[PDB]
Amino acid sequence: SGWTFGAGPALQIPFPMQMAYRFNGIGVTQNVLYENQKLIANQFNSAIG
């Protein structure tokens, strides 16, 4: 649900969209994630591993 459950009722949202908006929060547009999603997913998985 992203951060929506920290304010009121929990609102569903696909994780790629949530991550794109977390990028948009730091000043990088949505297109970066939607064009490198495989790379971000692999990097995050490797970091968690």
């Binding site: 696909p14 790629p16 969209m17 794109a20 908006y21 547009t29 949505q30 297109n31 939607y34 064009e35 999603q37």
Partner: protein, 66 residues
């Protein structure tokens, strides 16, 4: 995540893409305030071959009719 008007991706400027199941709208994050998807409300980035989940739809040209 994006719209593919003519073989070319389209991303929301500030909002999300939603739909009634027949028509596609661009709206805010906290309210369902639908607006017709126009080129002034979306920015082009990509070539409609890397984004996953992208739907075709159409956008509205505000200059072609006149």
């Amino acid at each position: 995540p994006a719209i593919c008007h003519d073989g070319k991706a389209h991303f929301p400027r500030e909002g999300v893409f939603v739909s009634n199941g027949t028509h596609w709208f661009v709206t805010q994050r906290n309210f369902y305030e639908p607006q017709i998807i126009t080129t002034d409300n979306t920015f082009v980035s990509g070539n409609c071959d890397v984004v996953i989940g992208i739907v075709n739809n159409t956008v509205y040209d505000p200059l072609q009719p006149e």
